[PDB]
Amino acid sequence: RHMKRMLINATQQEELRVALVDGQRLYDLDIESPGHEQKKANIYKGKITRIEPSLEAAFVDYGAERHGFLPLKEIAREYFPANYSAHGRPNIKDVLREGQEVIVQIDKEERGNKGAALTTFISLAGSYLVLMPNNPRAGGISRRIEGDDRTELKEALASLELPEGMGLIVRTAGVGKSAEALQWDLSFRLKHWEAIKKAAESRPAPFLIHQESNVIVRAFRDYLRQDIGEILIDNPKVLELARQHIAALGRPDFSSKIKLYTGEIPLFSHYQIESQIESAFQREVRLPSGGSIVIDSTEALTAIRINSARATRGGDIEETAFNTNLEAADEIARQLRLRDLGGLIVIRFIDMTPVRHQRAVENRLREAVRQDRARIQISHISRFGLLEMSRQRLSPSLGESSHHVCPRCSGTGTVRDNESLSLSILRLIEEEALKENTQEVHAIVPVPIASYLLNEKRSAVNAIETRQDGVRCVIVPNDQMETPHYHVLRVRKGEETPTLSYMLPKLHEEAM
Amino acid sequence: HMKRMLINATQQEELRVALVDGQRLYDLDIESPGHEQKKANIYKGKITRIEPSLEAAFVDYGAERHGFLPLKEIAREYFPANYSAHGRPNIKDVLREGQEVIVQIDKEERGNKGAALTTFISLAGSYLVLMPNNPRAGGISRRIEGDDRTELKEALASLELPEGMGLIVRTAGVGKSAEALQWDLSFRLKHWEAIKKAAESRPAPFLIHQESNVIVRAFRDYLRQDIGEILIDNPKVLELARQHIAALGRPDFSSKIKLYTGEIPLFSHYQIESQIESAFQREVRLPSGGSIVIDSTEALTAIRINSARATRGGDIEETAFNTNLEAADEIARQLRLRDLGGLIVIRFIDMTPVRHQRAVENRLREAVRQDRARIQISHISRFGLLEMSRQRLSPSLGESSHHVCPRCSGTGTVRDNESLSLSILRLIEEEALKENTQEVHAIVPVPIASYLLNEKRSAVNAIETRQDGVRCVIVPNDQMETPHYHVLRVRKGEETPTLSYMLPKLHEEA
Ligand SMILES: [Mg+2]
Ligand SMILES: [Mg+2]
Ligand SMILES: [Zn+2]
């Protein structure tokens, strides 16, 4: 059939995968490996253990060690005694006791080894709006919004049955939103809040109430709407928790959609999204019409390039550039989700002379990324032909978590040419043979550099041995070295070792 | 402090040309040998045939195939003195067999055709193209619009350009002062005198100017008003250097072109060698403890800036705005040293004041002024990124002297071993589900099998105890690296007792 489904794959404890499919076409992928958890925005219930009116704070045990550091400015009124006497409100001894119990969120994990900074002022974020149910002060509309939008937005913002004593924030992605579309994302949030408290009195101790980092909860909260037919799961220990979670987000209606999968064929291959999860791992993703896009990664940005197909019987180059650039706005948008790419992205669309064809593509792109859960901001095609854009780094991308740095080229895509580099070494040797008190000079190098430096540049090496006389210049071949790597060590008179040339790598792997 | 040109022609495959203010490097070309080209070469050539049918003429410039000079391309100076235009002319009347002419090559040889010629000579410098033979030519490039095109048409019309001549101002000239343009012009002129002197000094077919030559290109592209000496470290080159500077009509400079006789090689005497190695580093240190990080890409080039190792104090607003002015300077240089072309993208440190953002854009626009290549520059945008474009004069440094890493094919990354086992491990579970099937064979890199058969041991057993009567063999292979693999299947009936370590050579041989 054709249906919006959510597929979860939890067989290998090494990787939990959450695909979201629309029919038979994969829309978004999410991946968790265990360890190395980011416990930011997590909510617990914990016990005060150490009052300290000198730091104006209180260590709190929540079930991790060390306690975690809670300042007084971050304490809501509900945790003060019956009545309060304002003498500045500054002493902790006057606000709370040891062994009290409090609901707590992480505001800074966990810089240093010091406990993690905490706040009783809880923030529950969404696609549209951030509900802080503990704090009437804080409330606003995102800075990015302006124009008639702010007036329209702030006129659809007050129209809301928002409980008295909570305060909420509208988000970048909230513009244009309808007056009852914003109560749709607000019921989601304060249903959560009732469940966070339900599970707060539920039991006493320190325990985890909301786990912001977790793939499923993140994927339940952002994508679980009623056009999702099923939520197929293949590991029953995971389906148990998948229910405990949706209980916790306060939405136990949808719990019914959570079927289980027992079929023999591995779940993703049955539903035939396994090929498309592998185009996540490519570089050159072919497009439906023989075009291609090409995704590169650099220190602090990410760059895509569009290529058309090889020109075919003299067609129209402008309706080909246009048609390819539309197809690539679709795919760049999908690929941003499959890779969980985060930071500034930059795109080189094919050039098109009309302003009507550029706005067509920038639109096709705003649309394609509209339902993208993460914040996305876009600019317009520039003087040079580049579109800049940004995407919120929630999670680690496939590069950070399923890839590592190339051993040979050390990041770059390249290795210096052999001759180019050989010469670089030839002078780097001489540079060290023309110092004073230099008995020998050793140069461990890839087998083809050694080969080049001692046949085609043999005369140049010999030339160094005669100019600065007495200086033995030893160039070693090595099985354990490829084209970008070399060592060039110097030896001092009296430091001479009667060592063989082929034994010098074993003697110097120490050095190294 | 004197600005010098160092040439380094000791090694047979690498002429290295550097430019140094004192011992500060600021330019460089690393030209490999071979690959000569004839276009734009200037010859003296006897006319040899005349063929009205084509409204042309043929010229023996001294190549095997005579060249093809059309009527459309004949300066009026070669016309017979007694000449009456009575309509567009036929060429009988204009040229005679045996006439000597100064010719330039404007298309090379196209199979069995011979090179098209012109007597409308053009002498391109870095910034200008003098044209001593048509005053009808002129004006400015069409890729300069704006207050950049009017700032030219002024410094252009303040140049002392003789009667009969013409002058195209080039793209690379945008930012240049009237004094550099006035200096480039006076060198195209002196060159045009030499040419006429040499064409009169010897009646012939010979070669007068070799536009493509490694030495000529180095004087055009870096021999500039304020260059004090040219220190060369090969007698042979030095004798060529002097011949070319005499034929460029600066025959008096020939004496500044000194030799170098040292045991310490030249660039290491001026202690520049470490700065030339900076041009192949991916990261470059900055004076005040920062860094820049240049990374190439299919379509553009991408620079990141990083601030000092640490900030002792918290005037974080004056450590950011300084590291970013250093970066303008070192990028501008570093663009020159690598001859980087195409689109570049810079990610400066974020500064909150727009007055600081224009400060940087301005430093950078001033520093790419002494570059011979036109460099347009945008504004630090809403996302902190300054876009900018530089002109392709040459394939770049990492284009000529670099190739594509083989581990990853350009990526920068290889897939982790846990991510890639689990993929293989699903493709085994596919093949092994089939009806046809009896065994299934994976041939995988040594550490992948180490992973599948140890951490994922139980998961392979499960693939076997389920699919009842199917074997899963995972064989390590020395011969096979970080990314590659094979997953092969065996229909029921056709096995061999072929052991598991001899199973690579079986299937390999198949
Ligand atoms: Mg995703
Ligand atoms: Mg060059
Ligand atoms: Zn590599």
Author numbering:
A (entry chain A): -1 to 510
B (entry chain B): 0 to 509
Quote from the publication:
Ribonuclease E (RNase E) is a metal-dependent hydrolytic enzyme that cleaves polymeric ribonucleic acid internally and serves as a central element in RNA metabolism of diverse bacteria. The NTD of RNase E (1–529) is highly conserved and harbors the catalytic activity of the enzyme. The catalytic site is located in a DNase I-like domain, where conserved acidic groups D303 and D346 coordinate the magnesium ions that assist in the hydrolytic attack of single-stranded RNA.
In an effort to structurally characterize the mechanism of 5′ end sensing by RNase E and its interaction with sRNA, the catalytically inactive RNase E (1–529) D303R, D346R was purified and used in co-crystallization trials with sRNA bearing a 5′ monophosphate. The oligoribonucleotide comprises the MicC seed region connected through a tetranucleotide loop with a fragment of the ompD target encompassing the seed complementary sequence and the RNase E cleavage site (Pfeiffer et al., 2009). Crystals of the protein:RNA complex were obtained, and an X-ray diffraction dataset was collected to 3.0 Å resolution. An RNA fragment of 2 to 3 bases could be modeled with a good fit to the density at each of the two independent 5′ sensor domains in the crystallographic asymmetric unit. Given that the 5′ sensor domain is known to bind the 5′ end of RNA substrates, the RNA density was modeled as the 5′ end of MicC. The 5′ monophosphate is bound in the 5′ sensing pocket, and the RNA forms additional contacts with RNase E that were not seen in the previous structure of the “closed” state, where the substrate is bound at the active site. For example, the phosphate backbone is engaged in hydrogen bonding interactions with R373 and R142 in addition to R169 and T170 identified earlier as the core of the 5′ sensing pocket (Callaghan et al., 2005). R141 also contacts the RNA backbone and supports the second base from the 5′ end. Analysis of the crystal structure of E. coli RNase E co-crystallized with the sRNA MicC identified a potential metal ion bound in the RNase H domain not observed in the previous RNase E structures. The coordinating residues at this site are D26, D28, and from the DNase I domain, D338 and R371.
